[PDB]
Amino acid sequence: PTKIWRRWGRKVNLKEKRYAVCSSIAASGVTSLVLARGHRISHLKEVPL
Amino acid sequence: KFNKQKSSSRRKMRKAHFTAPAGLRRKIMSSKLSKELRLKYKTRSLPVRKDDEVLICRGHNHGREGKVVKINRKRYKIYVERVTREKVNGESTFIGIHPSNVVLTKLKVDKNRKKILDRKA
Amino acid sequence: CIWSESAFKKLDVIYGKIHEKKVTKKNYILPKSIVHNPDIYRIIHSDKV
Amino acid sequence: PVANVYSTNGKNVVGEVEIPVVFQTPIRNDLIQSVYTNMSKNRRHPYAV
Amino acid sequence: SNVSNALVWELTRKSNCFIKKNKAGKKGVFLCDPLNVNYKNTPSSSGLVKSNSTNVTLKDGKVVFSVKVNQHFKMKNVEKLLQQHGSKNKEKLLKKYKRLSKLY
Amino acid sequence: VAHNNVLPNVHLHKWWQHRVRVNFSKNIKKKKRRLLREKRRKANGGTPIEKLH
Amino acid sequence: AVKKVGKIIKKRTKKFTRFQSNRFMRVKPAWRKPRGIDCRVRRRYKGTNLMPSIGYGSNKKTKFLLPNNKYKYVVKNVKEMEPLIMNHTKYCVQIAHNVSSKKRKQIIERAKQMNVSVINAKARL
Amino acid sequence: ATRFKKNRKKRGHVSAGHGRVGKHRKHPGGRGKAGGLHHMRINFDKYHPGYFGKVGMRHLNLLKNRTYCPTINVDKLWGLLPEEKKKEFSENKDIAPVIDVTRKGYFKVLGNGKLKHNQPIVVKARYFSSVAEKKIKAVGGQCILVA
Amino acid sequence: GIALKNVGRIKKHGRKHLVSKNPYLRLLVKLYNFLARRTNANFNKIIAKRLIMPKRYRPPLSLSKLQYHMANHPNDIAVVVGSITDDKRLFSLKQLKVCALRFTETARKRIEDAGGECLTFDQLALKYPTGKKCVLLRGPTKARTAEKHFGKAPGKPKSKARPYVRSKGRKFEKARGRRKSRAYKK
RNA sequence: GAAAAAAUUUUUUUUUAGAAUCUUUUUAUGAGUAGAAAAUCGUGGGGUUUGUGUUGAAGCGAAAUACGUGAGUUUUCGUGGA
RNA sequence: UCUUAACCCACUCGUCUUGAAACACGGACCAAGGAGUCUAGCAAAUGUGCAAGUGUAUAUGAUUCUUUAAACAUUUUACGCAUAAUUAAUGUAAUAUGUCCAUUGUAGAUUUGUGCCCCACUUUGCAUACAAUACCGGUAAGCAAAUGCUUUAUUGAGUACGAG
RNA sequence: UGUAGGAGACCGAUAGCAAACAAGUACCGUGAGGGAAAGAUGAAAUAGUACUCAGGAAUGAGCAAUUAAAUAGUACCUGAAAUCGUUAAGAUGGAACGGAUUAAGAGAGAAAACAAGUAAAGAGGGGAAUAUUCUCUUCUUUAUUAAAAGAAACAUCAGUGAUU
Numbered sequence A: 001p002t003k004i005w006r007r008w009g010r011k012v013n014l015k016e017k018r019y020a021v022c023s024s025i026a027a028s029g030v031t032s033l034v035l036a037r038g039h040r041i042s043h044l045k046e047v048p049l
Numbered sequence B: 001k002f003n004k005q006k007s008s009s010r011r012k013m014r015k016a017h018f019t020a021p022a023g024l025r026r027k028i029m030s031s032k033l034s035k036e037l038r039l040k041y042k043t044r045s046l047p048v049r050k051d052d053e054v055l056i057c058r059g060h061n062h063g064r065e066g067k068v069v070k071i072n073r074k075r076y077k078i079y080v081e082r083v084t085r086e087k088v089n090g091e092s093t094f095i096g097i098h099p100s101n102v103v104l105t106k107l108k109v110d111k112n113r114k115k116i117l118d119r120k121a
Numbered sequence C: 001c002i003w004s005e006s007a008f009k010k011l012d013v014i015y016g017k018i019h020e021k022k023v024t025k026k027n028y029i030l031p032k033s034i035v036h037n038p039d040i041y042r043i044i045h046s047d048k049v
Numbered sequence D: 001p002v003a004n005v006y007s008t009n010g011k012n013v014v015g016e017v018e019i020p021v022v023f024q025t026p027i028r029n030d031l032i033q034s035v036y037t038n039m040s041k042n043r044r045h046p047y048a049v
Numbered sequence E: 001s002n003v004s005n006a007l008v009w010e011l012t013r014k015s016n017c018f019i020k021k022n023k024a025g026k027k028g029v030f031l032c033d034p035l036n037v038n039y040k041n042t043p044s045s046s047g048l049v050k051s052n053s054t055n056v057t058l059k060d061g062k063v064v065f066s067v068k069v070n071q072h073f074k075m076k077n078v079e080k081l082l083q084q085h086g087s088k089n090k091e092k093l094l095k096k097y098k099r100l101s102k103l104y
Numbered sequence F: 001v002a003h004n005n006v007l008p009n010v011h012l013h014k015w016w017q018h019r020v021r022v023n024f025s026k027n028i029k030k031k032k033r034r035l036l037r038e039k040r041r042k043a044n045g046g047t048p049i050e051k052l053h
Numbered sequence G: 001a002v003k004k005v006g007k008i009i010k011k012r013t014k015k016f017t018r019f020q021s022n023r024f025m026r027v028k029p030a031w032r033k034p035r036g037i038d039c040r041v042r043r044r045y046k047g048t049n050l051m052p053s054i055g056y057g058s059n060k061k062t063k064f065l066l067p068n069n070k071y072k073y074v075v076k077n078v079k080e081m082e083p084l085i086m087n088h089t090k091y092c093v094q095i096a097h098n099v100s101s102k103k104r105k106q107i108i109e110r111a112k113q114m115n116v117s118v119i120n121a122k123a124r125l
Numbered sequence H: 001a002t003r004f005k006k007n008r009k010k011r012g013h014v015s016a017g018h019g020r021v022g023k024h025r026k027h028p029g030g031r032g033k034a035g036g037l038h039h040m041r042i043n044f045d046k047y048h049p050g051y052f053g054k055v056g057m058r059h060l061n062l063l064k065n066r067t068y069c070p071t072i073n074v075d076k077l078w079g080l081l082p083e084e085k086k087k088e089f090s091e092n093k094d095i096a097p098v099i100d101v102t103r104k105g106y107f108k109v110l111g112n113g114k115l116k117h118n119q120p121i122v123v124k125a126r127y128f129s130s131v132a133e134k135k136i137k138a139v140g141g142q143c144i145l146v147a
Numbered sequence I: 001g002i003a004l005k006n007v008g009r010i011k012k013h014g015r016k017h018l019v020s021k022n023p024y025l026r027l028l029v030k031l032y033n034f035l036a037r038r039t040n041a042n043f044n045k046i047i048a049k050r051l052i053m054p055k056r057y058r059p060p061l062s063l064s065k066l067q068y069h070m071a072n073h074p075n076d077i078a079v080v081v082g083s084i085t086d087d088k089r090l091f092s093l094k095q096l097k098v099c100a101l102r103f104t105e106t107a108r109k110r111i112e113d114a115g116g117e118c119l120t121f122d123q124l125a126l127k128y129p130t131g132k133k134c135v136l137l138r139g140p141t142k143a144r145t146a147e148k149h150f151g152k153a154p155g156k157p158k159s160k161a162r163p164y165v166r167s168k169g170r171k172f173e174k175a176r177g178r179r180k181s182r183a184y185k186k
Numbered sequence J: 001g002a003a004a005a006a007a008u009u010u011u012u013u014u015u016u017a018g019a020a021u022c023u024u025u026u027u028a029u030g031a032g033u034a035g036a037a038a039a040u041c042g043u044g045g046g047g048u049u050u051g052u053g054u055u056g057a058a059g060c061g062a063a064a065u066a067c068g069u070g071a072g073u074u075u076u077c078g079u080g081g082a
Numbered sequence K: 001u002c003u004u005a006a007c008c009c010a011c012u013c014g015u016c017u018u019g020a021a022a023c024a025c026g027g028a029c030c031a032a033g034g035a036g037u038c039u040a041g042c043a044a045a046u047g048u049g050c051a052a053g054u055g056u057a058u059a060u061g062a063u064u065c066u067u068u069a070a071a072c073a074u075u076u077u078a079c080g081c082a083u084a085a086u087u088a089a090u091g092u093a094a095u096a097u098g099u100c101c102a103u104u105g106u107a108g109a110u111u112u113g114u115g116c117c118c119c120a121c122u123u124u125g126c127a128u129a130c131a132a133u134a135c136c137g138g139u140a141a142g143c144a145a146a147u148g149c150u151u152u153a154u155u156g157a158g159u160a161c162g163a164g
Numbered sequence L: 001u002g003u004a005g006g007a008g009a010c011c012g013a014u015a016g017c018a019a020a021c022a023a024g025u026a027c028c029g030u031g032a033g034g035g036a037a038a039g040a041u042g043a044a045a046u047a048g049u050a051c052u053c054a055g056g057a058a059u060g061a062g063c064a065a066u067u068a069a070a071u072a073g074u075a076c077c078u079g080a081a082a083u084c085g086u087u088a089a090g091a092u093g094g095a096a097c098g099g100a101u102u103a104a105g106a107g108a109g110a111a112a113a114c115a116a117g118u119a120a121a122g123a124g125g126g127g128a129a130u131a132u133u134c135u136c137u138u139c140u141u142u143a144u145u146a147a148a149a150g151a152a153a154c155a156u157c158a159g160u161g162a163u164u
Helices: A014-029 A031-038 B008-020 B022-027 B035-043 B109-120 C005-014 C040-044 D029-041 E003-010 E076-085 E089-101 F026-043 G103-115 H006-010 H041-045 H074-080 H082-092 H128-138 I023-038 I044-053 I064-070 I105-113 I121-127 I145-149
Strands: B032-033 B045-047 B055-056 B064-071 B077-086 B090-096 B102-104 E020-021 E029-031 E054-059 E063-069 E071-073 G001-004 G006-010 G071-075 G091-095 H072-073 H098-100 H107-109 H124-125 H140-143 I060-062 I076-083 I097-103 I116-119 I134-137
Touching: A014 A031, A014 D029, A031 E003, B032 B035, B055 B077, B064 B090, C040 E003, C040 I023, C040 I121, E003 I023, E054 E076, E054 E089, E063 E076, E063 E089, E071 E076, E076 E089, G091 G103, H072 H074, H074 H107, H074 H128, H107 H124, H107 H128, H128 H140, I023 I044, I023 I121, I044 I076, I044 I134, I060 I064, I064 I076, I064 I105, I064 I134, I097 I105, I097 I121, I105 I116, I116 I121
Parallel strands: B032 B102, G071 G091, H072 H107, H098 H124, H124 H140, I060 I076, I076 I097, I076 I134, I097 I116
Antiparallel strands: B032 B045, B055 B064, B055 B102, B064 B077, B077 B090, E020 E029, E054 E063, E063 E071, G001 G006
16 A cells, blocks of 8 residues: 655755755856757847846 | 635536535526626626527527527526427427527616616626 | 846845845855866867867 | 846846856756755655555 | 856757657657757757857748847848858858748 | 674564654644744734743 | 568568467467476477567668658658758658648648658548 | 666566575565574674673663763864964964863863974863873973863 | 687676766766877876766865875875865965865865965866876775775674674673673684 | 769759767677576656647557567558547 | 468477476466555665765744745754774773874885886885784783883774764 | 545546445345445437337338437447457368468558659749849649669679589
C-alpha cells in the first residue's frame, strides 16, 4: 500500500537556494537565454527591461 | 476565484448543478434580455416567465420568434408556440429549447416581476 | 522579465552594494565563479597560446 | 555596464541605471534545475490507501 | 565576464525550445531559431550562439530579411541590404533567398 | 548482518505503524498561532500582551 | 538472403518471431529474448527461430535511408516545414496521421512549391 | 526516484536479479544480530572486535553537564582575533591582547603547535595543560585561572 | 578461434570523461583537452586528467601547507587542482601566486590583502601556456576520515583500521576481543 | 574553400561538412547459465515547450515497396464520434 | 506482402535438477488483473553548496496569505555532527621557543637551469608507498616528597599545520 | 469517531470505501456471523419504433418510417480475443505449425524504380516597380528535344583464387 508517510518533501539548503535565485536572475539578464527559453522577444529593445 | 469559501472543484459543482432544488432551478433558467428592453431596464438578464415572447438564436430554429408555452424546471427546458414537431406515432409535441438559445423580447409585467425590475434598477 | 526602476535599484541594495539593516540579506555574498572569463575561443585565438 | 530605463510608452528612453552586480553571477544551469526539482517536490499533497 | 559563446552553446546544445528532433526519422535534428542560416544544431549556425548575423525567413506571408541589435526588412533590394549590413555565407544566403522566394 | 557495515540497532521492533504521525501542518499551525495572538493583542485595548520577566 | 538494391544493402528480412507464437495463441508475435534453463532458442539449436543480434545492423553511412533516398520527416503543420526547404534533396515529408484534410491539402501544396517529395500523397481524398 | 531502480534493469529474468539456484528466502540466517558467538561468530570477531561482555566501573547517573569542557589548542589562539587587530599587536610591542577563552565557548587550552616568538599574550580560561602553561610562559605571557 | 587476455579488448581504468554537468567545468575540460592534444607538454595532460577527477580525490588544501611548499622558490606560481581552504593556525602569508579551482571566501580576502594573486584556470592557461615556471600541487588525499576504515580488516592482527560504532564510550566494542583481559587482544 | 556536369565563350543544374559522449579514419576483436553493468525502448500522471481535433480525436480491425539489429516507432484504408 | 509447395533441417514450453524430448512436475483456451516496495536508521559510491566549520532546529518575522499545506526573511556562545585523543576511573592530554619557522629518510609527480624541440646531467622534492624519529593517554620497569620524575620498554579505533 | 466545510502531481468501474446502481441490500448460516453482483442510447425520446404485408403467436419483411447516425432499437457507447457461422481460395497416404532457400499462385503498390526544360493556350495563384506595367510560379492540356538511373552483355584493370 502507499502509506501517509512517504518522504514527501526535501530540506533544500539555504545557501544553494540563494545561489539558485541569484543565478536564475542573472540568466534572465542574458538575451540569448531568454530567446532560447522560447519567448517571441525578437522586437524587444533590451533584455534587462 | 480568490475566496476560499466557495468550492471550485469540478465534481462538487457538477453535483450541485444536478441536485439543485426548485427555487435554485427557477433562478438558473435565466435569459438574455433584448436590446430595447436592456436599454429600458438597465438589466442584463432575467428569470423567464410564461407569457413572454422569445427569439431563438441558437439551434435549428434560429429564425423563430414566439410566445412561451410551458417551462419545465425538472428537465431544464422551455417550450415555445410554433416549434412544434410531429412524433413517430403522428402526434405533435413541442421542441425543447434551453434558455441560452433564446433572447427575450417582450416581457409581461406583474407585481412580483415589478418588484424584481425595481430591485435591479 | 519586466522590472520597475525602483525594483531595479532595490535589487542592487539587496545583495549588498550599499547595504541596509533589514533589506540586505545578512552575511551573504554573491557566489564567485569557477571560471573568470569563459571565452575559450579567444584564449585559443590569443597570440601567446 | 549601464542599462536603459523606459517610459510607460516605449516611444521614449529615460535615465540610465547601472547594471546590478547580481547579474554577473555564474549561470549554473545544473544548480537551477536540481534545486528546482527538489523545491518543486515539497509542494505536493500526500496520498495513500 | 560571466557569459560568452562557448558557454551559451553548452547551455543551449540540449535545452532549447527551437530544437526540433525527428523521432520517426532517427537521423534528423533541426534548430529553428530565426537567425539560423542553415537549420543545423551547431554553434556554426546557431542564432543563439552567433555574435552578429544575417538571415532570410518567412513570416505571415511575406519573406523577411533580419539582421542581428535586431532589424527587419522586406531580390535586388535583399541583395543590396545584405551587401550593406552583412559580414561563403552571403553567397549561400542569396541562394537560400531565391529558393525561399518561390513560396506563396 | 554482513561484512564491514556497523551493527544494526533499529528500535521499531515493538508495533510502530500504529504510532507514526506526520506533520503536514507546520506552516498552517504557525499561521494559526500568530493569528490568534495578534487577534488577542488587537482585542486588548492597544495594551502589550507580553509580561515582564 | 541479403537484399541488395543499388547503394542500399540490408542484410536481413522476415521480421524476427517470438518463439512458440506459431503454436500457442497467447504468445505475442513481436520479439522477446527467451530466457529458459534449456529451450532450443537461447541455446542456438540448428534451424529454429534464429536470434537477432546487433551485427545484422544496416551500414552506418546509410542507416535510416528510405528507398526514396531521402530521410523521412513527419509533419503536422506548415510551420514545421520551415527547416526542410534547405534539405529538400535529402529529406522527404510524411504528413502526420492525425492531420485533417483541409490542413493536409495545405501541407501538400506548400511541399510541392518547395520542391520536396511527399510520401503519403493521396491520403484522405 | 523509482524509474532508476535496479529491478527495472533486470525486469524479466526469473530471479528478479537475486539468484536462480539458491533463491531469496525469508529471513535467511535468522533475525538481526542473532548469529553472534555461534554461526556468524567469524563475522563478529572479524568486523566488531571488542563487542561482547562488560568492562569497567559503573556510573549510576552521568548527569553530563558537570563534565562538559570543550578544548582548543594554543595553535588556534591568535586566530580568534580578526586579522587587522593581530597585525596591530605585531607592530606595537608595548601592549598585548588578553584573550578570554570563555567568550568563544571553550574551556580547556591544550598545547599543539608553535606560538609567535616574543609576542606575549594573556590567556584567561577555566583549564590549562601543563604544556600549555609552559608554552604561554615561554613567549612571556601569563595564564589567569578564571571562572 | 584465438586466445588473448580479455579476448583482445584492452581495459583502461578510471574516468573516461567528466561526470559533472556543470557548464563552466565542461568548458574547462574542453579547453584543457585541446591544450593537451595540441601541445606535447606533460603539464597539460596531467591538469586535464586531474581536472576530470571525482570529488573525493581532489582535496581541499590549506594555505599554510601551500606556503611551506612554495617556500624554496617564491618567485613562481602554484597551481592546485582543488579548492584552497583557510587556516587560523597560519599567522601570516608572504604574497603567493596561486591558481586554484575554488577559493574559500576568507582565503581570497587574506591572499589579496597580503598582496598575492588569485588565478582561475582560464586565466592560468591564458597567462602561462605550458605551465612554464609553475608548480603543480595537491593536498592530503589519503587523510580523509573514511579511508581509516579501509585496509587489512579491523581486528585482524596489528591492523589499524577504525571499527564502526554507535558511540566510543566504555560499553561499546572495548571488552571481549580487544585486550588481554577478555579473550584475545586486538 | 569551388568541384563537376548540362546547355547555347555566356547561361542552367547538382552539392559546398566543423554537433567534442561529435566527425573523419585505422586496426584488433565478437561463446555464455548463475551474476554484474551500460545503452536503449514502452505505459499512468507532472512541470516546461509547440502542436493535432468534427473537412472527425482517442480507441479499435485489416494492412503497409515504411524505418529500426531489436524492443518498437511510423503510416494507408476501414471502423469510431470525442 | 501473403499462399501453398519443394530440398534440407527441426522433440512440449516453463521448471527444479550432476543430468529433461522424457515413463519428472505445472500448463484445455482466452481476456483483463497479478509479484524486490515504502519508512526508519547506517554505509560506501558519486553528484552538488559551503569550508574549521557546517546544518537554521523548534520557532519567530513578513502589505506572505487562489496557487501559498510554498516561497521569502532571522539585531555584532541554542542544539547536532565536526574541530583531539586516551584510560575502568579521580581524570590527564600532542616537538618547543631555540624561529610565521611548518621532525628525518629512500623512491617519487611538477618546476628551474646547463651543455622553440628529444636527451643526459643538474635543480626543486607534491601525492603516495615504505620506513625512521619525536611526543600524548593507558600499562610496565627504574626511582620516588610532587606541577610526580626517567636516556628505557610497551599499548591505543593516538599525533606530528587540519577536512568536515 | 460523528457531522460540516475545503483539497489533491490520488483511483477510474476486475480500480478506488466491501459498497458510483433500491449495499450492509439480495443471498447463505440453528447461531455467533458470513455477505455479493450489477454505471454509460441519443443533442433531443415533449424523437423510444407509426403504417402495410406474411404470421395462431413470437416475430420477420417492406415500395412504408424517427434520427446527422438505428450494423445507436432499449441485450441500447466503443465493441478486442477465445469460440463459432457464410462464401471464396488453397491444402489433404499414421500429428500440426515451424527454420534456412528458392517456386508457383493470389493480392497490393510508384514515394528511386525514365524524360529537366522550351513552345503553343487554357485555368489559377503570388511578389515587385511607379490601377497597370514588370517578374516569379502551380495545375491542366497539345508536341518537343534533354538527360540521368538501375539491370544486363562483353571488354579492360586491380585483388583474391582454381586450372594446363
